[PDB]
């Protein structure tokens, strides 16, 4: 019965009990202090190759909704920037709040955005995601802030299908979705070494967080809130505030690409 979540007795403040790495040296998310985050002119340009991205399904895993990608080959791929080698896109998901004033995981000078998008990639030095997720150089997550304003057309295909995966365990067919519609024009970014922001909280993530947010409408985000954490036949719990508070930076340095 007990499973990790975002509630009072299974949430971020409780995770350390069943996942002691929650209190580790490289935990995510962090606050991005733009005064101390010093620029690095050695950082190579970021390369985002999503032209042949091949989506498979959209699903409710009880924590968020995931858009899964075909990672059998080097289709949609992230290279450059702080990354050694090639990282294959496997899935994307969001974090959001109960209201437009909170919802992001990272903060920028303690500012919270309405939501955060995470594009998850794993390093082809390893055989698959299951092997990479255990290694400090295993994953690269591209983090993108959402701010409420203009409706994003590239998000509409996602929003129009959320009613078919309202509850945990539902996974719908979802092909030919273009993740490039979810990117801002500028790819300037901050980067630091970190972790998964959910259990198992493994410290295997090179974080790449873009400075430019994308704009969504209040209506699009409010559709996110119509999802439920629970499965069919369980008490309803709206899926809201599925974000982790920021964690101590400890000895890490956030580097700017710009």
Residues that bind Zn ion (CB under 5 A): 18, 118
We find the least distance from the C-beta atom of residue 49 to Zn ion, in angstroms, to be: 21
- Residue 131 is given by DSSP the state H
Q: What are φ and ψ of residue 194, in 5° steps?
A: -160, -150
We find the least distance from the C-beta atom of residue 206 to Zn ion, in angstroms, to be: 14
We find the least distance from the C-beta atom of residue 242 to Zn ion, in angstroms, to be: 9
Q: What CA–CA distance (Å, rounded) separates 76 from 73?
A: 9
β strands within 97-249, DSSP E: 107-108, 115-123, 139-148, 171-173, 189-194, 205-210, 214-216
Q: Pick the closer one to Zn ion by CB: 118 or 223.
A: 118
What pairing do the DSSP bridges indicate for beta strands 205-210 and 189-194? Answer: antiparallel
Catalytic positions, please? 63
Please tell me whether 198 is known to bind a ligand.
yes
Please tell me whether 95 is known to bind a ligand.
yes
β strands within 102-138, DSSP E: 107-108, 115-123
We find the least distance from the C-beta atom of residue 28 to Zn ion, in angstroms, to be: 9
Please tell me whether 93 is known to bind a ligand.
yes
DSSP string, 9-54: TTSTTTGGGT-GGGGSSS-S--EE-TTTS-B-TTSPPEEEE-TT--
Task: Classify residue 152 as exposed, middle or buried by CB count within 10 Å of its CB (0-12, 13-18, 19+).
Answer: middle
Q: What CA–CA distance (Å, rounded) separates 188 from 186?
A: 6
Please tell me whether 2 is known to bind a ligand.
no
Q: Pick the closer one to Zn ion by CB: 13 or 232.
A: 13
Question: What kind and span of H or E run contains 224?
Answer: helix 218-224
Q: Pick the closer one to Zn ion by CB: 100 or 116.
A: 116
Q: Pick the closer one to Zn ion by CB: 23 or 44.
A: 23
- Annotated binding residues, written as ranges, equal 93, 95, 118, 197-198
- Annotated binding residues for substrate, written as ranges, equal 197-198
- Annotated binding residues for Zn(2+), written as ranges, equal 93, 95, 118
């Amino acid at each position: 019965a007990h499973h990790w979540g975002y509630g009072k007795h299974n949430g971020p403040e409780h995770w350390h009990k069943d996942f002691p790495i929650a209190k580790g040296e490289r935990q995510s998310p962090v606050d991005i202090d733009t005064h101390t985050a010093k620029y690095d002119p050695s950082l190579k340009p970021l390369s985002v190759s999503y032209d042949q991205a091949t989506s498979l399904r959209i699903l409710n895993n009880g924590h968020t909704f995931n858009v899964e990608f075909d990672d059998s080959q080097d289709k949609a791929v992230l290279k450059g920037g702080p990354l050694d080698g090639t990282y294959r896109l496997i899935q994307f998901h969001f974090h959001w709040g109960s209201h437009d004033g909170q919802g992001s995981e990272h903060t920028v000078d303690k500012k919270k955005y309405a939501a955060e998008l995470h594009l998850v990639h794993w390093n082809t030095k390893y055989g698959d995601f299951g092997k990479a997720v255990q290694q400090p150089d295993g994953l690269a997550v591209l983090g993108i802030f959402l701010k409420v304003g203009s409706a994003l057309p590239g998000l509409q295909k996602v929003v129009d299908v959320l009613d078919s995966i309202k509850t945990k365990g539902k996974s719908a067919d979802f092909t030919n979705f273009d993740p490039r519609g979810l990117l801002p024009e500028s790819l300037d970014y901050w980067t630091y070494p970190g972790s998964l922001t959910t259990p198992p909280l493994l410290e295997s993530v090179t974080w790449i967080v873009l400075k430019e947010p994308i704009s969504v409408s209040s209506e699009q985000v409010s559709k996110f809130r119509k999802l439920n954490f629970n499965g069919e036949g369980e008490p309803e719990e709206p899926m809201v505030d599925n974000w982790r508070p920021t964690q101590p930076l400890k000895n890490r340095q956030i580097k700017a690409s710009f």
